[PDB]
């Protein structure tokens, strides 16, 4: 199936060196060179919810668990359901993260829409990596990792997330939250910055980008335009992750101690050194 204007856009290529051997449009979906790759990755991956459903216990993805290896086995493998079989799921996950963000280029080079999209999933490629590769290779073994589940890695983040006291004292974490609540801060007015002009209240003539400049300059004193808030969505939604992968690339591997004990490096200053002031005083 294809759209009405999807007539002129149909042209073979996009893929690199080898030919148009893999680029057949199966339905509404694109099966380029990384299309059948993800077909190979998505077919094996549904079984990885069902494998440790006979080794760890339950058959329902409520408590299904293929645990990460232990902490100290070294630079190597593991048991199985408790690491070994866990060690196989990732290169599919990530091998499928990759075969997706780069099958887009077989459409990007196919037409001529920009290459800033093999990229906004690469802050998701550099956000799931920081929990599977970036951490547990150095402190001992692959045992420093989370479980894949949907209720297993839940009681892994809270009642097992106060190893560093409270994680709010974690400054970049809290800056990578000074970056996150600001994502829907600028989707809430921009997802409503194109809605109510052809549908004003009912009947009225449509607005142009000069009413935008009498509504938002009549809002919050800053009107960078309409191309300043798509440079104000891709500024809300990619970086709360490098300020979290930096809230953790120096947390646990260097600071497996209380980050509530980090906020006593601030009160130590020669000026007010030997001085208890307020609350502290």
């Amino acid at each position: 199936a294809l759209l009405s204007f999807e007539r002129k856009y149909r042209v073979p290529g996009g893929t690199l060196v080898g030919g148009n051997l893999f680029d057949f449009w199966v339905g509404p979906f694109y099966v380029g060179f990384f299309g059948v790759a993800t077909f190979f990755f998505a077919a094996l991956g549904i079984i990885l919810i069902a494998w440790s459903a006979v080794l760890q216990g339950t058959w329902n993805p409520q408590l299904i668990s293929v645990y990460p290896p232990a902490l100290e086995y070294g630079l190597g493998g593991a048991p199985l359901a408790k690491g070994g079989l866990w060690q196989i799921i990732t290169i599919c996950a990530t091998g499928a993260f990759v075969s997706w963000a780069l099958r887009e280029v077989e459409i990007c080079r196919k037409l001529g829409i920009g290459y800033h999209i093999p990229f906004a999933f690469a802050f998701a490629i550099l956000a799931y990596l920081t929990l599977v590769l970036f951490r547990p290779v150095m402190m001992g073994a692959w045992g420093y990792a989370f479980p894949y589940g949907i209720w297993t890695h839940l009681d892994w983040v809270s009642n097992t997330g106060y190893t560093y006291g409270n994680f709010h004292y974690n400054p970049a974490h809290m800056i990578a939250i000074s970056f996150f609540f600001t994502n829907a801060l600028a989707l809430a007015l921009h997802g409503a910055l194109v809605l109510s002009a052809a549908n004003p209240e009912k009947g009225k003539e449509m607005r142009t980008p000069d009413h935008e400049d009498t509504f938002f300059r009549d809002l919050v004193g800053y009107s960078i335009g309409t191309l300043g808030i798509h440079r104000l969505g891709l500024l809300l939604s990619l970086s709360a992750v490098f300020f979290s992968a930096l809230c953790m690339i120096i947390t646990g591997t260097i600071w497996f101690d209380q980050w509530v004990d980090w906020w006593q490096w601030w009160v130590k200053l020669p000026w007010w050194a030997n001085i208890p002031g307020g609350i502290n005083g």
Binding site: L2, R7, V11, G13, V26, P209, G225
Partner: protein
């Protein structure tokens, strides 16, 4: 209320919100049409809605949307696979019949209007707002195409007000017959420009803007689409292009 109540006014009132939302994103484009002009396979589980009345910003008519969807504009792809699926290929050269990577559309002859009573995009010789009167000022320098050779000379800027921005970079030919080219692809460093899209002997194939000051919404389709035409094919196959089109960083 209770411990088991409120999660049900939700598994229902919102279990059709991917349903109600999808159709509202499936206005334009649909219905689905085949590879010729034919009531196609179908639409989907979220079929297209029958549109409501659309009032336009400068009295451009009763253009309901989804609107015109048929085969008005010329298309030229020689159907390789008569079966629906396998792609199609242009007749002669793909940058003359306008098929593949270079796209456009036929619209009405009323350009984009703002609210002052005037058009949207004008050159610097159509708005004496900001000028040149201090030091030495760069609005007039030579360029280079993707063939790695000089292409022309750009000496002007199409100004903007509401966005205070820019949309085109006008090229003074040897003659004067107008040409155009987009804005974001560009990659200028020092004293000469480099574009990596079109070769320097395929710039006249870019339509002369009917007016050197006006861009009608009809014209603003190929004029920012021919460069996309050269982002797919270019360029088979051997030697310099391999050290030009591939690699790079930005």
């Amino acid at each position: 209320d209770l411990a088991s109540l409120a999660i049900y006014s939700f598994w229902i009132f919102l279990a059709g919100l991917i349903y109600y939302l999808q159709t509202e994103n499936m206005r334009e484009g649909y219905p689905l049409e085949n590879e010729d002009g034919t009531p196609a396979a179908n639409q989907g589980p979220f079929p297209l809605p029958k549109p409501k009345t659309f009032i336009l910003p400068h009295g451009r008519g009763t253009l309901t949307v989804p609107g015109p969807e048929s085969e008005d504009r010329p298309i030229a792809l020689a159907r390789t696979a008569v079966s629906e699926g396998f792609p199609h290929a242009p007749t002669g050269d793909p940058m003359k019949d306008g098929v593949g990577p270079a796209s456009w559309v036929a619209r009405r002859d009323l350009p984009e209007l703002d609210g002052h009573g005037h058009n949207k995009i004008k050159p610097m010789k159509a708005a004496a707002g900001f000028h040149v009167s201090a030091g030495k000022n760069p609005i007039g320098l030579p360029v280079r195409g993707c063939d790695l050779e000089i292409a022309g000379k750009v000496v002007d800027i199409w100004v903007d007000i509401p966005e205070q921005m820019a949309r085109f970079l006008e090229v003074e030919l040897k003659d004067g017959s107008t040409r155009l080219l987009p804005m974001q692809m560009v990659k200028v460093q020092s004293n000469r420009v480099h574009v990596n899209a079109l070769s320097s002997d395929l710039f006249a194939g870019i339509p002369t803007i009917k007016s050197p000051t006006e861009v009608t919404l009809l014209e603003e389709d190929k004029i920012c689409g021919y460069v996309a035409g050269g982002l797919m094919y270019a360029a088979p196959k051997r030697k310099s292009v391999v050290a030009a089109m591939l690699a790079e960083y930005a």
